Amino acid sequence: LPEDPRWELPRDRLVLGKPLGEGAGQVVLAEAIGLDKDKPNRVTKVAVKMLKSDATEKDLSDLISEMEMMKMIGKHKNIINLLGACTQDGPLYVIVEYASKGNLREYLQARRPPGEQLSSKDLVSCAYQVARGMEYLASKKCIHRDLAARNVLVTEDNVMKIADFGLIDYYKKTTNGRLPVKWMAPEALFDRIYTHQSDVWSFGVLLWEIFTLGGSPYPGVPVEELFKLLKEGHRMDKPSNCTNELYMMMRDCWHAVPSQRPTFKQLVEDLDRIVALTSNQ
Numbered sequence: 001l002p003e004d005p006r007w008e009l010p011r012d013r014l015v016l017g018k019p020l021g022e023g024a025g026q027v028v029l030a031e032a033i034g035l036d037k038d039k040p041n042r043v044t045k046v047a048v049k050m051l052k053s054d055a056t057e058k059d060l061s062d063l064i065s066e067m068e069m070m071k072m073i074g075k076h077k078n079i080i081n082l083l084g085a086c087t088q089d090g091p092l093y094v095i096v097e098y099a100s101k102g103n104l105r106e107y108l109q110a111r112r113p114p115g116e117q118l119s120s121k122d123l124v125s126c127a128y129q130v131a132r133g134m135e136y137l138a139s140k141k142c143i144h145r146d147l148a149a150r151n152v153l154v155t156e157d158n159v160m161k162i163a164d165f166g167l168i169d170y171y172k173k174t175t176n177g178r179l180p181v182k183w184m185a186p187e188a189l190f191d192r193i194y195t196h197q198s199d200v201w202s203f204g205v206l207l208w209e210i211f212t213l214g215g216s217p218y219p220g221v222p223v224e225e226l227f228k229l230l231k232e233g234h235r236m237d238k239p240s241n242c243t244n245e246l247y248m249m250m251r252d253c254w255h256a257v258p259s260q261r262p263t264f265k266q267l268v269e270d271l272d273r274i275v276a277l278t279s280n281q
């Protein structure tokens with residue numbers, strides 16, 4: 001691989017830790033010593049993406065393309081930023097920001113009341129940050145294609161960061177058994193058309209995910225039945241503990257006509273206003 005001095009990190013400055021997630025492409029917790037040359041004695045907790053034992057040549061290509069995509073897209077608070085890479089004299093390591101509190105689905109579920117505590121403002125605030133993150137990506141012509149709570153990460157300071165933005169079997173399930181088709185917009189699901197507007201649909205589900213504290217969409221619904229519901233124009237019920245205004249927002253996001261869905265630009269402005277008017281108690 002060519003070196004790119006801007007981003008390169010010597011391997012002796014990277015102490016690998018425990019695995020965060022696998023694939024069979026995998027991710028590992030690590031510590032970078034002097035991630036920026038200006039601050040060389042600092043240790044930073046990072047996540048390192050790398051190949052697994054039986055990766056293809058095209059798997060490598062994909063990881064490289066992901067790295068280059070991130071360089072193109074640039075920095076933003078509400079995305080997982082590239083920090084560095086090891087491309088020389090050893091396997092490819094792609095160093096990204098570490099998110100201590102896991103993905104948003106896990107974060108929400110872990111903070112459900114008994115049967116630490118997220119206020120109404122916290123929930124709305126969560127949606128704002130995710131919208132702000134998607135607006136940036138969208139402004140950089142980046143289409144996520146699987147925007148969901150599982151692909152939003154949460155830092156030590158409760159900052160929402162969008163993941164796997166720089167990357168089909170419909171019946172394949174996620175790590176804990178959810179079907180990604182349930183986040184897909186109709187035009188994407190049927191006509192295989194992906195736009196920013198299709199991400200807005202998916203953001204609609206993400207909203208629903210938030211105000212159900214990591215609820216599972218369409219529980220017990222297989223793929224064939226999902227097609228049925230969408231063709232019938234069915235829409236998920238308003239969650240309990242969720243205003244009409246926010247439900248309207250989801251419904252707007254789930255507008256059958258893509259052009260009639262709001263832009264993330266609009267969703268950022270609306271959520272800005274709502275956060276400030278939502279109480280923290």
Ligand SMILES: C[C@@H](Oc1ccc2[nH]nc(-c3ccc(N4CC5(C4)CN(S(C)(=O)=O)C5)nc3)c2c1)c1c(Cl)cncc1Cl
Pocket residue numbers: 020021022027047080096097098099100101102103150151153163164
């Ligand atoms: C595939 C992996 O990809 C990445 C890519 C960059 C990252 N930066 N930071 C992470 C990360 C860091 C910590 C972390 N966890 C530690 C905990 C969740 C488990 N709890 S705990 C220790 O309190 O029980 C927090 N999960 C993910 C991370 C994961 C991933 C995972 Cl494991 C979970 N959800 C989404 C995705 Cl995309």
